[PDB]
Write a protein that binds this ligand. Structure first.
Ligand SMILES: O=Cc1ccc(O)cc1
Ligand SMILES: O=Cc1ccc(O)cc1
Ligand SMILES: O=Cc1ccc(O)cc1
Ligand SMILES: O=Cc1ccc(O)cc1
Ligand SMILES: O=Cc1ccc(O)cc1
Ligand SMILES: O=Cc1ccc(O)cc1
Lengths: 177, 177
C-alpha cells in the first residue's frame, strides 16, 4: 500500500452559469438531447445523427456537421461518444473520437462534462449550468490555446440555448465573471 | 476525417451544493489546500503531506493517512496525484494513484473534480460547491457500489468543512439534480 504510479497531468477548465426564467426540465429538453445538438447550438451545427449505438444512450456516437467557416470552405464534421449519461440527474459526459472540427479536433482526448442543477425555490429558482473540459497536453497546442478554442463555443452555445428557450440573453450570467 | 475510435464508457456522478454564510475565498482556503486535506476532512483524515513534486502544484502527489474505519481495523493510506490546478478559478482535479483507503482504493482510475463558483452578489451571494468523480468500469465492482462509497464521504467532507469555517451545518444544501 506504500507505493504509487505517476500519471500525466491534464489541461482544462470548468465554467458555470446561472440561468433565470427557465426550469431544469426546459433546459434539459434542449441540452440533454445529445444526438440532436443541431437543435441546440444551431448557429454552428447544421445537422446531427447517431451513428453507433442507440440515440442518447451511454456508449453511443453522434456525428454532427458544422456550417462552413467561410465562403469557399467545406463543412466540418465531429464524431463524439457519450461516455456517461444520467438523465435522471441531468448530467452527461462525452469525448471527441473523430472528425475535423476546427480547433476541437486538434486537442488530444477532448473530454467534456455537462451538469444541470436547480437552485432552491425560495431563492427564486433558476438553473446552474456546469460545463467543463479537459484535454491531454500535446506539443501542437497549449492550455491557453485550448481555452481560446473552447470558451467562445460554450459562450455561443449558451446564447443559442436562450434562443431556443425564447428567453433574453440577459437570462444567463457567467459565474465569477 | 470520416472515421472514429470507440472507447469504453465511465462510471461516475457529479454533485452540487449551495453554501451560504461564507465566502468563496474562505471555502477555498480549506478545500483548495490539496496537500493538507487533514485540515479539511478531519473526521476521516489523520495526517497528510506532499510526497512528490511541489505542494499544490499540478503533478504533485499527496499521501494521507486515515483513522481506523471501524474498531479493530488498521489505519489506511491514500496516494493521490493533483492532475489539474487553477487556484484563481477555484478548481482542481485529482486521481488516486496508490494506497489502500477503504472503498476508494477498490475503484479503477478514480478521478475527482472540485470546482467552486460564486453566486451573483446581486442575487444574494453564496457559493456553489461542485464535486464529481469518475471510475473505470471493472468486473470486481458496480457503479452503484462506487456511488455508495463516494457520496457519504463527500457528505462528511461538507460537514467537516462547516466545522472548520465555523458556520452551521445548515449552511450547506445539496442541490436537486
Ligand atoms: O454523467 C454525468 C457526469 C458528469 C461529470 C462527472 O464527473 C461524472 C458523471
Ligand atoms: O463541447 C463540445 C462541442 C464542441 C464543438 C461544438 O460545435 C459543440 C460541442
Ligand atoms: O422569490 C422568493 C420565493 C420564496 C419562496 C418561494 O416558495 C418561491 C420564491
Ligand atoms: O475524493 C477523494 C477523497 C477520498 C477520501 C478522502 O478522505 C478525501 C478525498
Ligand atoms: O511508509 C512509507 C512512507 C512514504 C512516504 C512518506 O511521506 C511517509 C511514509
Ligand atoms: O473524470 C473525468 C476524466 C477526465 C479525463 C479522463 O481521461 C478520465 C476522466
Amino acid at each position: 500500500a506504500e507505493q504509487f504510479q505517476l500519471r500525466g497531468v491534464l489541461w482544462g477548465k470548468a465554467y458555470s452559469w446561472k440561468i433565470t426564467g427557465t426550469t431544469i426540465d426546459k433546459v434539459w429538453s434542449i441540452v440533454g438531447d445529445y444526438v440532436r445538438v443541431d437543435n441546440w447550438v444551431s448557429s454552428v451545427v447544421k445537422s446531427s445523427h447517431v451513428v453507433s449505438g442507440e440515440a442518447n444512450q451511454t456508449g453511443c456516437v453522434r456525428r454532427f456537421v458544422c456550417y462552413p467557416a467561410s465562403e469557399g470552405e467545406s463543412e466540418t464534421v465531429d464524431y463524439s461518444e457519450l461516455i456517461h449519461m444520467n438523465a435522471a440527474a441531468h448530467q452527461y459526459m462525452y469525448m471527441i473520437v473523430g472528425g475535423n472540427i476546427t480547433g476541437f479536433s486538434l486537442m488530444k482526448n477532448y473530454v467534456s462534462n455537462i451538469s444541470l442543477s436547480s437552485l432552491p425555490e425560495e431563492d427564486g429558482g433558476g438553473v446552474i449550468f456546469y460545463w467543463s473540459f479537459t484535454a491531454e497536453p500535446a506539443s501542437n497546442l497549449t492550455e491557453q490555446k485550448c481555452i481560446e478554442i473552447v470558451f467562445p463555443l460554450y459562450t455561443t452555445a449558451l446564447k443559442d440555448l436562450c434562443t431556443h428557450l425564447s428567453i433574453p440573453e440577459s437570462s444567463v450570467t457567467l459565474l465569477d465573471d
